[PDB]
């Protein structure tokens, strides 16, 4: 049982909490974007899976776009509550959430909210230049269902919450 505890300490890479939702979960991470679709935080088979960080994101300080995935569970668990952000009332009352990494906590300031079925541009993690990230931000701001008070520049860094399972639900916020 302490073998399982050592496993958990490598696998769990953070914590996520959004007030007034079920989303209050450990963030897991493996070598791909698949294992934690099908396993819980104890590494046992489970359809609900876990909340998990994209395998490409391994540097908080430099990653321009860190992506966290979870199922849109029909029982309302995992990332089903991301859809509350399509209700304007909820968004105004919850402009931020908290994201812990392995080091420390951030209060993320949401600036874009949308659903998407076939346009997955938002999953880019690699930006040769600072100018490439500003093109990215322009595109995803335009994809948003709201115009945001929050301005954000190619100099900022962001975090993306996304379902992974018709359309995905996506929330993006400024670190």
Residues that bind a copy of itself (CB under 8 A): 2, 5-6, 9-10, 12, 15, 24-26, 41, 100, 102-103
- 116 contact, one of Cl ion, a copy of itself, none, CB 5-8 Å limit per kind: Cl ion
Inter-residue contact 80 to 72 (CB < 8 Å): yes
Q: Which is nearer to a copy of itself, 63 or 124 (CB)?
A: 63
Inter-residue contact 11 to 41 (CB < 8 Å): yes
Least separation in angstroms between CB 116 and Cl ion: 4
Q: Which is nearer to a copy of itself, 100 or 134 (CB)?
A: 100
C-alpha angle 50-37-71 in degrees, rounded to nearest 5 = 70
119 lies in the site for Cl ion, by CB under 5 A: yes
Q: Which is nearer to Cl ion, 52 or 69 (CB)?
A: 69
In the chain, the N- to C-terminal Cα span, in Å, equals 36
H or E stretch covering 161: strand 158-163
């Amino acid at each position: 049982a302490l073998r399982d505890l050592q496993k958990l300490n490598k696998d769990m890479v953070g914590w996520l909490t959004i007030i007034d939702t079920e989303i209050d979960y450990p963030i897991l991470q493996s070598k791909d974007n698949d294992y934690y679709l099908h396993h819980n935080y104890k590494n046992e088979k489970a359809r609900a899976g876990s909340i998990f960080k994209d395998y490409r994101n391994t540097n908080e300080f430099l990653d321009k776009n860190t992506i966290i995935y979870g199922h849109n569970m029909k029982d309302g668990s995992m990332f089903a509550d991301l859809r509350k952000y399509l209700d304007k009332d909820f968004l105004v009352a919850h402009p931020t959430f908290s994201y812990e990494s392995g080091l420390t906590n951030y209060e993320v300031e949401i600036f874009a909210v949308y659903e998407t079925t076939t346009d997955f541009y938002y999953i880019e993690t690699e930006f040769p230049e600072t100018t490439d990230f500003e093109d990215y931000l322009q595109k995803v701001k335009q994809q948003s269902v709201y115009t945001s008070n929050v301005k954000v520049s190619g100099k900022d860094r962001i975090i993306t919450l996304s379902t992974c399972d018709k359309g995905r639900m996506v929330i993006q916020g400024k670190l």
